[PDB]
Amino acid sequence: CCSNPACQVQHSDLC
């Protein structure tokens, strides 16, 4: 989903 620490943990297409 993104190259973030949280994104990797939880699939969240925020970017």
Side-chain angles (χ1 to χ4, degrees), residues 2-15:
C2 218
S3 40
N4 270 71
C7 214
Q8 56 182 247
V9 179
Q10 288 280 300
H11 187 27
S12 32
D13 49 279
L14 192 68
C15 302

